[PDB]
Design an enzyme around this catalytic site. Structure first.
Site, PDB file in Angstrom:
ATOM      1  N   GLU A   1      19.003  76.737 -21.404  1.00  0.00           N
ATOM      2  CA  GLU A   1      18.906  75.560 -20.557  1.00  0.00           C
ATOM      3  C   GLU A   1      17.451  75.135 -20.418  1.00  0.00           C
ATOM      4  OE1 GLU A   1      21.478  73.872 -19.856  1.00  0.00           O
ATOM      5  OE2 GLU A   1      20.064  72.330 -19.176  1.00  0.00           O
TER       6      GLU A   1
ATOM      7  N   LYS B   1      13.615  78.916 -26.276  1.00  0.00           N
ATOM      8  CA  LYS B   1      13.508  78.751 -24.831  1.00  0.00           C
ATOM      9  C   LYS B   1      12.203  79.346 -24.319  1.00  0.00           C
ATOM     10  CE  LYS B   1      13.977  78.231 -20.520  1.00  0.00           C
ATOM     11  NZ  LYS B   1      13.589  76.912 -19.947  1.00  0.00           N
TER      12      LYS B   1
ATOM     13  N   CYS C   1       9.313  80.115 -13.816  1.00  0.00           N
ATOM     14  CA  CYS C   1       9.586  80.487 -15.203  1.00  0.00           C
ATOM     15  C   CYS C   1       8.370  80.495 -16.126  1.00  0.00           C
ATOM     16  CB  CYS C   1      10.672  79.581 -15.788  1.00  0.00           C
ATOM     17  SG  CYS C   1      12.339  79.932 -15.145  1.00  0.00           S
TER      18      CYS C   1
END
Ligand SMILES: NC(=O)c1ccc[n+]([C@@H]2O[C@H](COP(=O)([O-])OP(=O)(O)OC[C@H]3O[C@@H](n4cnc5c(N)ncnc54)[C@H](O)[C@@H]3O)[C@@H](O)[C@H]2O)c1
Ligand SMILES: NC(=O)c1ccc[n+]([C@@H]2O[C@H](COP(=O)([O-])OP(=O)(O)OC[C@H]3O[C@@H](n4cnc5c(N)ncnc54)[C@H](O)[C@@H]3O)[C@@H](O)[C@H]2O)c1
Ligand SMILES: NC(=O)c1ccc[n+]([C@@H]2O[C@H](COP(=O)([O-])OP(=O)(O)OC[C@H]3O[C@@H](n4cnc5c(N)ncnc54)[C@H](O)[C@@H]3O)[C@@H](O)[C@H]2O)c1
Ligand SMILES: O=c1ccn([C@@H]2O[C@H](COP(=O)(O)OP(=O)(O)O[C@H]3O[C@H](CO)[C@@H](O)[C@H](O)[C@H]3O)[C@@H](O)[C@H]2O)c(=O)[nH]1
Ligand SMILES: O=c1ccn([C@@H]2O[C@H](COP(=O)(O)OP(=O)(O)O[C@H]3O[C@H](CO)[C@@H](O)[C@H](O)[C@H]3O)[C@@H](O)[C@H]2O)c(=O)[nH]1
Ligand SMILES: O=c1ccn([C@@H]2O[C@H](COP(=O)(O)OP(=O)(O)O[C@H]3O[C@H](CO)[C@@H](O)[C@H](O)[C@H]3O)[C@@H](O)[C@H]2O)c(=O)[nH]1
Ligand SMILES: [Cl-]
Ligand SMILES: [Cl-]
Ligand SMILES: [Cl-]
Lengths: 426, 460, 460
Positions: free
Chosen positions: B161, B220, B276
């Site tokens: 995502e 990612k 993140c």
């Protein structure tokens, strides 16, 4: 004020094309534009050209000597211009820096002018952003034009005089005006950002080889984020050219001089990663050939630092070749555009014993143990590899340092090649 | 040939909730069940007040909660019935043992894999959506194969995502790209193509990228690393600008107009935050060391070192400007969230700037228009918070009698404040430390008022 | 049941010659052909004077040369008719490029593998006898598979040699063990058993060890490393003895009487020499670096560092004892071979001790009862050799007017010299530096004569 006469000191890789694109006195399509202006508004009579806007477009090579060896820029050519300019000037005239220089170099030019004054010389910064091989297109439709000057009423008027020149063919919104130091620093920072993208994707390519990921798939996924963009994400044996390593190392040297060691080692990684990408590619070739390549024939396909040019400055082919030459390999080098005399100069200080310059790729691959592709020339994708395989010693290897043979791996493996490329697990 | 009619998602968090809500909104003919062990979090999804606040999220759930979207605690039943199983559980940084502070803790991922293969028969597609280390799907495939059954065919896919905080619904409905990774095997392509059909209900085909499983997982990590690298790069330039007389905003503009570089993510700051960026870069660094790639590890480590250096030097700038001591001095901290228009404080630069000033004995008065005061108290703790930290109700209370105003978050309201009023009740000389460039263009007025204003990337 | 009946050995050097001579002597019904590209060496094997000297070797060749033992330059035919092909070519340390001074140069091995697969049809067993890096047989197998023919079945084995200088015939006829490594496949196990049958003609079955190919290659390297480690360990103790008053000979005796430790290879010295100890240890270190084993690499690097330290500190002891200057001083170097009873000087500690004293401008007078004088000149050259180095023809000439006598090789005659005569014509004070403990028990008599006697592992 209105600029009507322009002088450019330095008619090389930069000064020529820029002024070719008002009495102006000093690549595909370059020969065409010059012929339409030579005689109407477009010599070695330097002093009169000065005495009648002055572009400084002389070379600024990395210092190969003394303090700052291999990192700092040599400003001796820039200063020679500044002395000669102030000798032959009266009244108003605008001196504009186009060469890639360290930050605050315009302060030195202003010092020279003020100490040799007469009973008004304005200094501007106007860096160049063209890329070799596409220079004419970049000059005709630039992404942006950057002009720097002092934030004084006298300085701001000199900026507008140069803006008026570019506005005849550059949109007003594509012309950015800043202070003198921001302009000089932006040129260095821009090249560092570009080189950093290449070193980042090359760092990923090493991760891909160790994990089973593919650098081309990863680059595509990265590039589809519009905040990152999809340009300058082509993994390679290492970036070359005359300006990327020079401008980043200059940036690193400038930071060490300004007591910014954290910033210096931050940008130093861009160069270290590029060197590691080269060295591990060479070690991969040597290891695959059973850790010895003495008297083995190896074909070097591609010697220019990028396709569609004959320039070899800081080309990865030079460093890859020297690594194999240190191992005693017999190099057969083919490049469709680099002059053969240039290849000899780059590999010199051994060249007679180990280096042979082939006239076609099939001659270079005849009886070779490996084919090493260092430049992304389009013709390499279309070679007859079944023919090449027949005359190669076995096992026959292909080392693709540019991802030009992607999609051809199954055919090459069926023919009998062991094909290895950057960013793909073997 | 296969068609996914029923979807189960293990994990009803910031990712599992909105992603599955959008999937249901664009796919009426597909049941979507979002499960979780947290009982209070599941009922909150069925309440009027959703547990996470996302613009536009409340309206999407209410148009599907009951039709094809459900929240539940029955994890085993949702797995039994599903054709597609999303793994969307948290993967926090290990705070213990080998790889402490860098490696990811996969205990929740493994628990899912154990629970999935137990409650499963027949054909199911298991898809990694959580941020996992490269080759994590190999571990999932080992768990499934070592606990196999007759006529049990579990396919493992990667589907990371890329949504951002504050625009998730915007990002989910119109993504830059959808990334799906699977094997080259015939079974792998069929599971990949089945998941493509789900996304094709509202994502154009040219925006759906299919790669191998490892490229998907690594992309990612690499994507977040590239973004953070742009911020650290422009922050490194900001230090150069302060020492040369250049301006980082002018330099950023000049750099960003090169279309190969782009003009996004070049806003210099006291340092990037969020849950993140530091986590994924450090995980990338740890993976490289484990794979014997020290050059690659120290390359990406510089992104973190630069971010840390940008924070420390800003706190050092405050202390040095305040006559080298801030002990018992009142200092206003304007902005505590890691970015504007949110209440999230995870890895916010305001935390580190405050702790630096707290270590010097400063009296901090912190104001943030959206962050709850209890969160600020938790972030500054391990006492010290009781003696030094005061949480103000408006910026004027925090600036009353303060020596300096430190702006750490780019809240728009900070640009529109009465600085003549603040200057009158501040101790003299009064300083403004702008860590976000939000007060650009106001330097003439603030200096005329009497402030000494200092900002990142501009010579003082 | 395959039976080896004709053997070809590529390489008629120190290894290939004696090993094949013993195989011919013990296997009268096997034709053994030793080939080489050097014609002068091949003819020397057929002449009544052998190129390499080993006690008992001349009798073995003369008893077989013509019956089943042959020395030819026809390499291609010997390969064509052989059932077993020995590769016994040199594998020197790379003096260039990547791995300089540590990695082995495999160009001669590869030359054999290409020439073998070209001149071969049918079934042949190819055996690595040279000291090769681990996984070198994998490279040989790739050459064979990449140049395959119809009916071509080449099996690759490892069979290292452990003979030492001076006892080659004794070691070959009665080896401690015969080591054979091959692939753990039916094709490989069959090839292993065929080579065992050759050695089973005179080696007891329990002394023939069969392993996989990699264990065999690694065992050759590790065996030499373990031997060199014993010398460096006892040499490290010798330094401790000099600083504490202990005696390394007493300590070595006490250590060696533990039957788990053994009493062999515990003789302290100025440093071990020979052509294989440093090369195999350094190759092992290089292998560990390529395989990302830095802990193992620095573990074995200590064997070399300790050997270098033992040499340097012995040279520094001479210089310090001679009032810190030895420029233009005459120094006698007694012993230049790397051990007694040989003329081999490869990696001899005498070379390094001499170069240290030459760097100080000392006048070296070197005597060795067996090393050719031209070899000494080659070893000490890059001049400096002409000004400083003099090669004596008896020890008394070398000690005439010298400040010190430096004993580097344990020749038995050095214990029997007339030291009263040497002392009378030496400058005073006169020093003896015993780097081999050969003058033990003579210290009282030498001190009474007037010498200052210093030896390794004994407090002065
Ligand atoms: N792609 C590019 O090559 C490019 C693009 C942007 C910026 N730049 C920068 O522009 C500058 C121009 O470099 P270049 O690649 O065009 O090299 P160049 O070949 O133009 O070198 C400058 C030349 O100027 C001539 N010259 C004329 N008058 C001179 C004088 N008074 N003193 C010294 N030399 C004089 C010399 O013959 C010299 O060879 C460099 O600083 C470069 O880094 C290069
Ligand atoms: N902006 C972002 O936060 C974002 C963006 C992209 C990807 N991701 C990644 O996606 C993942 C999901 O992150 P999140 O913010 O949604 O986390 P989260 O804290 O909301 O956790 C998701 C939910 O999973 C539940 N859960 C954990 N183990 C479970 C189990 N065994 N069974 C059932 N439920 C279980 C937890 O209770 C939690 O409610 C993370 O790995 C994150 O790195 C995050
Ligand atoms: N005591 C020892 O010396 C000893 C003990 C065990 C193992 N080894 C190992 O044995 C190997 C051989 O050592 P050596 O002392 O016998 O060496 P050497 O130099 O005496 O013998 C090698 C011979 O091979 C010949 N040769 C080389 N390449 C050839 C080719 N392509 N075709 C034909 N002939 C070729 C050379 O001319 C030479 O006569 C080395 O790897 C060494 O490390 C040595
Ligand atoms: O994705 C990429 C792009 C480029 N390269 C390599 O990087 C080098 C530089 O390529 P490029 O930037 O096109 O060449 P230059 O002619 O050096 O142009 C650069 O240098 C000029 C001089 O400073 C600047 O004006 C330009 O903006 C900048 O692109 C070459 O060796 C390329 O093969 C890659 O490896 N991957
Ligand atoms: O020019 C910039 C841009 C951002 N930031 C800072 O960067 C941090 C992160 O910003 P942002 O990207 O909006 O944060 P997130 O909302 O966490 O989103 C990021 O992290 C998500 C979690 O993985 C990813 O999915 C997204 O793609 C990625 O943008 C914040 O502290 C910002 O202040 C800057 O300092 N300068
Ligand atoms: O206690 C001891 C034993 C030996 N050495 C020295 O060690 C070196 C090597 O001696 P030695 O092992 O006898 O010589 P090599 O003839 O090289 O034989 C070794 O090297 C061969 C490979 O070349 C192996 O096959 C043998 O097993 C191994 O003993 C010489 O300088 C000796 O003076 C000592 O200093 N102290
Ligand atoms: Cl794999
Ligand atoms: Cl650790
Ligand atoms: Cl200034």
């Amino acid at each position: 004020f209105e600029i009507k006469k322009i002088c450019c000191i330095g008619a090389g890789y930069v000064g020529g094309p820029t002024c070719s694109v008002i009495r102006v006195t000093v690549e595909p399509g370059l020969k065409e534009v010059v012929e339409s202006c030579r005689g109407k508004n477009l010599s070695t009579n330097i002093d009169d050209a000065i005495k009648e806007l002055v572009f400084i477009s002389v070379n600024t090579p990395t210092k190969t000597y003394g303090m700052g060896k291999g990192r700092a820029l040599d400003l001796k050519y820039i200063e020679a211009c500044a002395r000669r300019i102030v000798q032959n000037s009266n009244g108003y005239k605008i001196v504009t820096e186009k060469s890639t220089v360290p930050v605050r170099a315009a302060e030195s030019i202003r010092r020279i002018f003020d100490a040799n004054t007469k009973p008004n010389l304005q200094v501007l910064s106007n860096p160049e952003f063209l890329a070799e091989g596409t220079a004419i297109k970049d000059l005709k439709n630039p992404d942006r034009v950057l002009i720097g000057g002092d934030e004084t009423p006298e300085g701001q008027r000199a900026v507008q005089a140069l803006c008026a020149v570019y506005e005849h063919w550059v949109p007003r919104e594509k012309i950015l005006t800043t202070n003198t130091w921001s302009s000089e620093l932006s040129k260095l920072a821009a090249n560092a950002f570009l080189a950093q993208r290449i070193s980042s994707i090359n760092s990923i390519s090493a991760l891909c080889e160790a994990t089973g990921a593919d650098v081309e798939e990863v680059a595509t996924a990265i590039g589809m984020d519009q905040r990152i963009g999809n340009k300058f994400l082509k993994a390679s044996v290492g970036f070359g050219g005359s300006c990327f390593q020079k401008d980043v190392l200059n940036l690193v040297y400038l930071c060490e001089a300004l007591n910014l060691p954290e910033v210096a080692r931050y940008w130093q990684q861009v160069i270290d990663m590029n060197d590691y990408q080269r060295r591990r590619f060479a070690s991969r070739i040597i290891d695959s050939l059973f850790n010895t390549v003495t008297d083995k024939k190896i074909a070097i396909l591609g010697f220019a630092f990028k396709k569609d040019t004959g320039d070899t400055r800081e080309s990865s082919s030079i460093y890859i070749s020297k690594y194999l030459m240190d191992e005693g390999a017999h190099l057969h080098i083919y490049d469709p555009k680099v002059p053969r005399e240039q290849i000899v100069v780059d590999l010199s200080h051994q060249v007679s014993r180990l280096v042979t310059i082939s006239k076609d790729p099939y001659e270079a691959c005849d009886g070779a143990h490996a084919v090493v592709i260092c430049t992304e020339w389009d013709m390499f994708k279309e070679l007859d590899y079944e023919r090449i395989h027949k005359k190669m010693l076995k096992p026959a290897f292909i080392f693709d340092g540019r991802r030009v043979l992607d999609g051809l791996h199954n055919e090459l493996q069926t023919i009998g090649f062991q094909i290895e490329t950057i960013g793909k697990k073997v």
